[PDB]
DNA sequence: ATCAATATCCACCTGCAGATTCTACCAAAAGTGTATTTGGAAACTGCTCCATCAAAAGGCATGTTCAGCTGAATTCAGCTGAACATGCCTTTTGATGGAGCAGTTTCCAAATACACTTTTGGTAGAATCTGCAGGTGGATATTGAT
DNA sequence: ATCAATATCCACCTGCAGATTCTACCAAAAGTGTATTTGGAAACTGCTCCATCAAAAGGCATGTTCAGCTGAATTCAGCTGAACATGCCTTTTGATGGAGCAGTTTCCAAATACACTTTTGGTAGAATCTGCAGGTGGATATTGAT
């Protein structure tokens, strides 16, 4: 599933970040970091979800999880 | 006849007051605290919308979109430090190519 | 036959993608990944807006990490982002 | 029935740029911003009241919180506007 | 004048884990800081949880969710074990 | 009148449940506080205190002393991954740092 | 009134900056590090002292306390243990 | 004859790294540090001769020395990344931009 | 530095679908008018704790010398990474059905708040205890020159 | 591969500053007993979300070619570390005066409580408008050859 994060997509993310030349081992490295990030957020998000006794995570749950990792996100309520 | 009108504000003094009483902040809330807080919020909103309208009409549009807010916030040092750990959804980044990467 | 020198098309894509704000990961692979991680933790449903919010957060995180790591790349007199650059940036950030 | 700051943000926008509009997503950005700064100031003011064993949040706690939370010139202008609003509200 | 502290209980717990070890006053100050910091973290997150869900009461369920959100991994598992076990033993009688 | 038992004793705890309850009700956290919430919180605080004191006693008798000083607390925390993450933005007065010389700097 | 304090950032001597660098593991030190370190230290102290005296004066006091310093540090995300009195 | 004894450059630096990483004493002299703090406090408008309790000054020095030491560790990581051994101003400024300062 | 030859970028247009503005209605906040209560500001006061003071000694800061090793500057080949054409399959898009699940209401049984009234654990000194700091002096490792 | 020069380590010792125990008082839990809330148990209902499907396109996977970067190897001027003499100023210790924290009392300006009346903000279609998909066509940059 982590391979669905395609190499051209990682290349695009890097270009938005200003990177002009990209080593061949970055892509699997990038997948690693993204996995950790997603795990940390999702664990917190569904935690909020199950505290409210719901089986559907909402945008507000994601917002609370992000803000508790110090990454406040604007635009989703 | 509203509290906002008497303070010369657009932001709602009475709603700010109710949110203060119901946010578990203190046993009591003084009469001037919602007025002061509403005024500060209206000021910060005015600063951001000022810069964002400027950025939006600089690129030949009359509609504020997230990109304009992002350029406004990131291109102003004090707003940038105030919102330094905030990400503006669909705002992108500032154009920035490090000079060593241009040819010559 | 026409052929650009290595680097020119890269600077063009830097310019194209820093002026745009679209999501850069395709939706289905990302949402499938997210659902898999969610199950590997817990059988929950997902609001669509919740998945969009997650993807914005993740792509912003990755872009800013690339910026920091590239600062390290240029500090080391290189132009090629390398895994060491990303790892050192995440050490200095505090993760 | 859901509350938001859209009405008042639109009023302030009409004051600052009468013929500029705002998209739905940017209005959500602005709601997020207003709620974030509110929670910041109100939380700091709550902690200030508690540190000093006071039970009431007054405009003095709001002003100290604004001083602690905003940078430099932003803090000066916000304090000026807040004090001015409290004066005009007390006059009437 | 009279100042409360957690020193008594920190020292009791120290004797439980290390019967022949003592603690210097500066180290006891570190430990008092630790207890107050973790208290504020857990209680603040529990307050936020209760508010998000429009409940006016902070119950042990909010304490448990906050412990899961704030502590890492094995620490969180064991903290939940101890809290749940203390709450059952206290409620039985 | 019945015999006075403390809430800590009924929960089998060293940390004071009643003082935690007073701190919860007077910290403006919520209009109401449930009966078990101070017990659960006092138990977690006692657990985490026990963990730090266990590791710090270990560090103190590794350094052949019988009194925990701040340096021992710092060695305890930094040498344990999970405590280190929990206290990652914490400064421990007079705790120093962990010995760490990068290998590239040793003589050839 | 006290005596006049001037040019005190120079009291942060070069050997003290060296000791700080050694605790940080630094083996070789460029000659321009000392003025950089003084700059950084002054910026840090200004931010924390500004916040500390804000707490002090909100409390209607003329004495900075350890808790004032602790609160200012914590508002900069730098929690300090050991000074809770 | 005789030569006077002399350690090679680097030996004493590693000696002092070892010596100061096992110790926990404050490394800035106390009085100059307190004068710096008092001068900055006065030069700040809200300072109208505030007093300082002794614990407050010790707390500030602890925080400031921990901050500087960790900034030196981070900047030195950047130094080594650049295949150098000499810490340079560039390293410190880049380390604090990446930290978020 | 020029020309000639592509290739890409980007300013500008139109017709219109989709996004906002604009109307009107209505629960639900906000505001009002009284009636009471009370948190904390003032105004003492008692007494810690800070701010200077002074002197002594001895730990270190400073300035100097000079040589070793470092950073900086250059060169260059191997091999990595970029650019690109081709064709294939994963993702998008659209539809349709239905489950299951988030909101909402109405009651109470259970839980919590609070004022009084015993009851005790916790705190502040005092009174004792006791690691360990801070001295020797020998043993053992490390370093640098030969 | 050795030795001389240092540095570091390590065991042992004792007196005292700092830590641990001991008392007695009293604030603050604990116990009791009524008074308010509230959190779900059942019972709904309308709607987001998931699950299949199906076709298509446009984005990606692959393989080829080669330009230019990265890492390695060299050279060297000068910067920074090491060692040291000198003497300054930081640290200790104790005193001395007084500012100003903090404990206590009194008492209103301000805050809360409550019953009712207005007013607003939110919502959902109708009515307007604006970006935007998808075209240029000129401007601006890139590439290779001279
Ligand atoms: Cl007020
Ligand atoms: Cl409970
Ligand atoms: Mn001055
Ligand atoms: Mn009162
Ligand atoms: Mn070199
Ligand atoms: Mn007793
Ligand atoms: Mn010793
Ligand atoms: Mn070649
Ligand atoms: Mn209206
Ligand atoms: Mn277009």
Numbering used by the authors:
A (entry chain B): 25 to 101
B (entry chain G): 15 to 118
C (entry chain A): 38 to 79, 83 to 135
D (entry chain H): 33 to 124
E (entry chain D): 32 to 124
F (entry chain C): 11 to 118
G (entry chain F): 18 to 102
H (entry chain E): 35 to 135
Share the article's original sentences.
In most eukaryotes, the centromere is specified by DNA sequence-independent epigenetic mechanisms, and the centromere-specific histone H3 variant, CENP-A, plays a critical role as a key epigenetic marker for centromere specification. To visualize the H4 N-terminal tail more clearly in the nucleosome, in this study, we used a chimeric H3.1 containing the CENP-A centromere targeting domain (CATD) region of CENP-A, called H3.1CATD, for the structure analysis, instead of the CENP-A nucleosome. Therefore, we propose that the CENP-A-mediated structural polymorphism of the H4 N-terminal tail is the structural basis for the specific H4K20 monomethylation in the CENP-A nucleosome.
To determine whether the H3.1 Q76 and D77 residues actually define the H4 N-terminal tail orientation in the nucleosome, we prepared the H3.1CATD(V76Q K77D) mutant. We then determined the crystal structure of the nucleosome containing H3.1CATD(V76Q K77D) at 2.58 Å resolution. In the H3.1CATD(V76Q, K77D) nucleosome structure, the Q76 and D77 residues, replacing the corresponding V76 and K77 residues of the H3.1CATD, interact with the H4 R19 and L22 residues, accompanied by the H4 R19-DNA binding, as observed in the canonical H3.1. As a result, the H4 N-terminal tail conformation in the H3.1CATD(V76Q, K77D) nucleosome adopted the inward H4-N conformation, as observed in the canonical H3.1 nucleosome. In both the canonical and H3.1CATD(V76Q, K77D) nucleosomes, the visible H4 tail interacted with the acidic patch of the neighboring nucleosome in the crystals, and formed the inward configuration. In contrast, in the H3.1CATD nucleosome, the H4 tails in the outward configuration may not interact with the acidic patch of the neighboring nucleosome. These structural findings indicated that the H3.1 Q76 and D77 residues actually function to constrain the H4 N-terminal tail orientation in the nucleosome. To form the inward H4-N conformation observed in the H3.1 nucleosome, the interactions between the H3.1 Q76 and D77 residues and the H4 R19 and L22 residues are essential.
